[PDB]
Symmetry: C4
Subunit: 397 residues, 4 copies
């Protein structure tokens, strides 16, 4: 959407994974202070998003929906003021249905009223779910009209609010939602697992009528590669929250997860604990050079160039004629992987000079690997990535 | 739906399989008395559901549809009074179409009138079919509006009536029907057969435009595992009626059928003979410990954790930190099957203590198997199950 | 539909395959006289259906569409009178679109006017195509409304006209069309070929968005077996016209084609030459015992019981407790095939007596094969059938 | 559509591939002069189509959308006059959405106004894209209504304008668009590559909800063969622009690409450089005998008769009882391929004389191969074709 927001993908943190329905004012305020104090804020993670279970049990006579008075004894607005004081922005969650996924009151048919409430509170960001939608889906037009009702509602408040769709790829939001929202979930929810299939996440492709949840990292990657082509500044594919630090994956698996989310220009919303961040977690989420790929001014997702057995190659443009290249090894053992210049710049063929000498930097290690021509061969860990920046292009005029 | 009904899955018995179109007042009354006298009523099977072929050949001038005067010489109301006197509840069948599946007058366009008639009769339960729907399906919205017309009609009578959808999973009722009905058929009709495929049941997955009938037990299980995630108190996936005792399956096959229907929180509607219940049938349908799994206060279906060849593992939470675990052997020969603690509590990883010693009870045998740590290995019959309750959890804080 | 017509499947002959766009008054009249004189009329083939290319180039100022004055110099009505005089009924073709498949003026938006014209002419039968439908398809509701407009138009003339849908299975007419029409094409058009696949007939199952044409006999059979379950007196699945005698198949292939169309209760519309009928053709299309299966008073299609490699078994009820059984050998060489009593009456299990001695008749040979118990084993030609009638049932009370 | 245009498939050249967003008045005028001077105009390539990025940044107060004043300092009309003076016709691009694929102002909701502007400018041809369509797709009816709005808008100007749909096969334009437009894209965009699969072009068949781009030549061919059956004079399947000369394919690959596009009666729109045409390019795009196949008066696409491993046979009618035959070798090595008379005229079986002696001409070589009976065997290069004309038919009366 052309609303001045999400010019690059949004970055932030969300209450759900850590706090769930135990979310309250004090936990949110402590997390926001940890986000600021740890350095995450200055790295770019500036949205603090209050997920499901903030809601009071019933709407007011006035029809507005206030926050639970026990969890939020001052109401939401004074909490948002405290977040704003930290130099952070505040997000809120609802659903495009009668109820949220957690069974709380949601916004279908109350879009104007709820948007007005959030604007009054100082909310800067809405995550808008797809539970209990009363059969208002199944065609792009049905889903469009329902999400457009809230998009219009937000707009009319006059307050800029980042509009994050959460409809799990149903009816193709990469087609229908691109001018009316800032980002759209493309799949069922990720879980803290690298590649285990699950019956609650039956779909393996972008084309899905039951998005579900418990979708592995690899499941989501195979869906994302089809829809990257639709992503633009202000309008991103959302691969769901980052699981880094939660413990169900190893470090190389988290590195893969973070790398691909970053390079495909997903929003980078932390779905973890920010109050006790281990060195292992900091290594993955606080690398400025990797963040700079996600936040790159060319606004282009990396493309998947090939799949060879369990190996995958990604390649994308970055600013100033540079290139991001990712070797991904989905196999159970470490492997030597090779990227050729003709593959890295495949879409430019035949206008590629394979003999061109180019400096390659390893962005995780934050070191130059030196100059290479023709191809590069590197060790890639099991379930692992090597994330490379080419400091020039082999493309011929 | 939030109408105070089906807080746990409904249990009962239906006239179709035994009586079909020969259904009449006396057969229903004899079955209700057998349900009460055999102990089935006190076990929880309290709904007596009159299926298709009760209808008079034409509507009254008043537009109401009365019962066939030969089959029901006093009308339906006095029969419902007799059922109520036995401490039982009464159900009736119609279709969301111009005709029922049996070709009798049905309720499309007459929803208010028919609901009013049923309320006057004292009906407590509606099974609402999907035959002859005049093309009013193919999107979630089309099917939603048609089923919502009857949901609203029932509601406005002021009489609580359990609303059982019978649209065979068309357009995803687990999404559209969850706030407007109490349960929804997810597949084409079961038949008295464990695993034989049939051309009238072509679909093998939840995503289906021709649900059909003659779907085997195993066919239905493979569909159900995708949609369990949507089930909630008051709003259940319905795997169709129980075939136990009809004779086309052996005892271990019926045990599997009953176990999975119970653990996936399907309604448990007996589709059999209640006037002559063999010891073999009683063993399967009158086990209080198995019924207690279906009726568990946590209201959670068991999840399918893995498929390994013809073997399947299910695991789900029960009340007071206990767990239901099912080993299912779909192979033609008995096998030793193993469940590990890490698999049983997979969604909790890494917060699982595999060394935790826990008592395991066999619910069919109704005996403690003793304490186990790490894994359990058991003999499982061909087309068979072992149904286990873990008396504590291995989950770590 | 409940309009008194197609109580059994319709039988007849259609101008297209033989005459195409060269159709005219004299050719139709000569074919009708051949139908009467050859004995086809008295066998049951009583509809003479005028297919595409009868139309005048433009509608009248009055908006009616008359017949081409060169091809039909007296108009259609006097030709229909001549057909009626032969004891035959007359059919006409149009499309539910702006143009017919041949590019002539069709009936979308003119349904009342065109139905009125046909009734005035004495037409008894409409074949109603799906070409040029202006995007009015893609959901059951879209296709339903378009076909309902003509169904209503025909009805209001007061003249009984058999309503034959020709929408090639799009959006599932076996669901939507069953109360508003007498029969519905379920697939793209057959061609004179037993099993050759073709890119114009890409779909292999009932679920299809491009029905196309050049669908082989075997292609159509594999689609039909899914939808047989929906067929009822007055409302039939239509497997398209019979190719018998056209020359692109051998006699055993035509026997298979005719047998399956007959036993699945398809309309039997001859799509061949009736003015020169060879002995080989008469053997296939003039066998009263095979016609009696199609016209059986139980109105039930035979069901496909199994597929074993290239072999298929069909079994269905006939009147007076008899059974039709078909062994079908889709393989390139003759084979001995076996049907067991438990398979023939599979849906009745366990209530089947496999030792029951029953007389079996070969309907093509028109001879008793004697009595059998348990199973029957017979020689079946390449691409061939054996068509059997069991003179009693093995089903136990 | 019956608007007097595209009686044979349109031929021309499009600005996108060569000039992209650097398109301007002078480059267009130089290309039009090269088209005329090189002989391309007189061969039939007479449309000069201005693609995306011509647009001014905002609409006028009057609501019309003018051209970028820097790129087009005289406006579009005087440029169209210059094109007309060369004996050429002018085309323009927009999208059926709020924005074009390049992010410029597009025509949804402004169809009458924009059509009026183009008619005033003297535009003869519209390419009408499917980007940013606001969820107005997903059924044939949704897409139909959106494309019909522009079709009607063009018509009402009174100026004949060739209406080229560019919706990439979404919702089946071969069904819905055939009477309201002159041609319809059937797939995601071609790229300069013979057979490399790409994740942005996930679909391999005509049935697709994400058409994407980077579809190889072979990918598009496998889609086209399903829909050829729908093509008619004035209403063509569009296989996207010709890549010939761009360099990412070899000469035999381009020959295959051009041959199949020509024989399937695709529009032949050059998507290359016309200002420097190599001898290798001229050999492929300036062969009058191949163009004569595309422009043949029988207006019939060739049909794919078989696929045998990596080999394919195409056969179609041409004027005066002649036949086009194509042997296509998609394998990596040259092969001897055989076409039999029974396969070439398969749809005429059994009325084919395989012994019929017929002269066969090689259209690329422009030489007679002499007379053949029964079959022909020829060398076919890797990724290659042999394009044949049979000077008579083997079909028997
Ligand atoms: C409620 O909804 C409304 C409606 O959506 C929304 O209002 C929009 O708000 C956004 C954000 O503030 C506005 O977007 C900004 O628009 C600025 C002006 O854009 C126009 O002018 C540009 C400059 O023109 C100069 O140069 C051109 C050269 O071509 C020359 O002719 C001119 O004479 C002039 O000198 C021009 O570039 C721009 O063109 C773009 O769009 C056209 C049409 O699609 C396309 O052809 C071009 O290729 C180009 O993409 C346009 O015509 C703009 O400068 C500004 O852009 C800067 O910031 C954005 C991010 O905001 C960056 O992406 C970009 O790189 C720039 O640095 C920005 O896009 C928009 O105008 C409003 N729309 C309307 C209709 O009012 C509200 O915000 C919503 N409110 C709430 C509370 O939610
Ligand atoms: C025709 O249709 C109508 C419309 O659907 C239907 O009317 C409904 O009927 C049902 C059944 O009788 C009613 O449901 C009951 O509602 C009871 C009241 O619920 C509210 O209040 C609860 C208690 O509030 C206290 O505690 C809170 C703490 O949070 C505190 O703030 C308050 O001040 C107060 O002290 C509250 O818990 C409840 O909240 C639920 O819902 C909200 C919003 O979605 C969510 O945020 C919460 O998480 C929670 O889930 C709500 O606000 C309720 O007590 C009662 O629940 C008991 O029984 C049910 C089953 O019935 C059990 O599931 C449950 O465990 C409890 O033991 C029950 O749910 C409902 O209110 C009617 N709705 C309306 C609009 O009238 C008719 O019945 C239909 N008629 C016919 C004939 O068919
Ligand atoms: C324009 O459209 C209209 C609207 O569709 C159409 O009008 C219909 O035309 C058809 C054909 O003429 C009519 O159908 C006939 O109806 C006859 C009467 O049917 C009723 O009565 C039957 C007998 O009742 C007796 O027995 C019962 C025992 O149960 C007893 O109670 C009664 O007191 C009485 O003594 C009854 O059997 C029948 O019941 C059927 O339907 C109901 C409801 O769905 C169902 O519950 C039953 O199971 C049963 O199926 C009904 O109530 C009927 O006799 C006759 O049937 C004979 O012929 C048909 C074929 O026509 C055979 O299939 C059958 O075996 C019988 O031999 C037939 O069906 C219909 O009534 C019209 N409908 C209306 C609303 O007017 C026009 O024809 C159209 N016009 C044009 C020009 O196209
Ligand atoms: C190692 O790789 C780097 C690129 O990562 C090479 O640097 C590149 O060197 C080329 C040739 O010297 C530079 O191109 C030149 O640019 C100048 C203008 O600055 C122009 O006048 C020349 O015509 C030529 O095109 C290029 O700028 C430079 N790129 C970067 C990003 O620095 C380096 O040469 C490689 N080392 C070796 C030993 O080859
Ligand atoms: C056999 O398995 C059972 C569980 O099915 C084990 O019983 C469990 O024993 C543990 C440890 O003794 C109990 O946890 C403890 O709870 C008390 C409070 O009651 C707390 O103070 C301790 O810190 C500790 O957490 C647990 O309650 C109990 N669970 C149940 C359901 O009884 C039993 O120990 C096993 N036997 C052997 C030999 O290990
Ligand atoms: C050869 O097969 C035929 C059936 O196709 C056998 O004929 C059937 O014979 C049985 C037993 O004799 C008959 O059932 C009986 O019916 C009478 C009433 O008629 C009843 O009183 C008995 O209790 C018994 O159920 C049956 O009607 C008859 N079916 C037909 C269609 O004729 C025949 O017996 C077989 N031959 C041999 C040597 O087994
Ligand atoms: C080489 O192939 C060509 C066809 O490409 C053969 O030419 C064809 O020859 C036949 C028989 O001579 C011609 O048919 C005849 O037409 C006349 C009327 O012109 C008719 O009176 C006869 O009954 C017969 O049907 C046919 O016109 C002609 N076709 C063409 C396109 O020229 C030629 O015969 C072959 N050469 C050899 C040695 O077989
Ligand atoms: C932050 O997390 C770390 C690592 O998980 C915690 O360090 C552990 O402290 C506990 C309890 O005091 C000990 O059992 C372990 O020895 C420590 N584990 C490791 C890996 O070092 C730490 O407690 C947390 N920080 C705070 C202040 O709670």
């Amino acid at each position: 959407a052309n609303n001045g927001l999400a010019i690059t993908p949004q970055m932030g943190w969300n209450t759900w994974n850590k706090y769930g329905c135990n979310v309250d004012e004090q936990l949110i305020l402590d997390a926001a202070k940890a986000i600021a104090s740890s350095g995450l804020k200055d790295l770019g993670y500036n949205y603090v998003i209050i997920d499901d279970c903030w809601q009071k049990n019933e709407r007011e006579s006035s029809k507005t929906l206030l926050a639970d008075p026990t969890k939020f004894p001052r109401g939401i607005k004074p909490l948002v003021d405290d977040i704003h004081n930290l130099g952070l922005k505040a997000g809120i969650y609802s659903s495009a249905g009668t109820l949220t996924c957690g069974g709380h009151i949601a916004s279908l048919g109350y879009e104007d009223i709820d948007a007005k409430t959030w604007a009054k509170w100082g909310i800067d960001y809405l995550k808008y779910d797809n539970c209990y939608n009363q059969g208002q889906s199944g065609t792009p037009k049905l889903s469009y009209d329902r999400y457009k009702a809230m998009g219009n509602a937000l707009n009319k408040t006059g307050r800029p609010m980042l509009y994050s769709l959460c409809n799990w790829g149903e009816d193709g939001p990469w087609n229908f939602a691109s001018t009316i929202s800032n980002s759209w979930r493309i799949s069922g929810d990720v879980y803290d697992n690298f590649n285990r299939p699950d019956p609650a996440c039956p779909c393996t492709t972008y084309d899905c009528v039951l998005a579900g949840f418990r979708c592995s990292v690899m499941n989501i990657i195979n869906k994302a590669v089809a829809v990257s082509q639709k992503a633009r500044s202000g309008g991103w594919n959302d691969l769901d929250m980052l699981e880094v630090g939660n413990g169900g994956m190893n470090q190389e698996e988290y590195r893969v997860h973070y790398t691909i989310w970053a390079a495909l220009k997903s929003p980078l919303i932390l779905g973890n604990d920010v109050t006790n961040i281990t060195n292992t977690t900091k290594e993955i989420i606080m690398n400025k050079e990797v963040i700079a790929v996600n936040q790159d001014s060319s606004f282009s997702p990396a493309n998947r160039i090939w799949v060879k057995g369990d190996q995958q190659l990604f390649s994308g443009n970055l600013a100033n004629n540079t290139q991001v290249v990712i070797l991904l090894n989905a196999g159970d053992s470490a492997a030597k992987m090779t990227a050729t210049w003709d593959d890295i710049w495949v879409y430019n063929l035949p206008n590629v000079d394979s003999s061109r000498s180019i400096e390659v930097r390893d962005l995780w290690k934050q070191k130059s690997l030196g100059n290479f021509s023709n191809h590069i061969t590197l060790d890639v860990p099991a379930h692992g990535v090597r994330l490379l920046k080419f400091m020039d292009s082999a493309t011929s005029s």
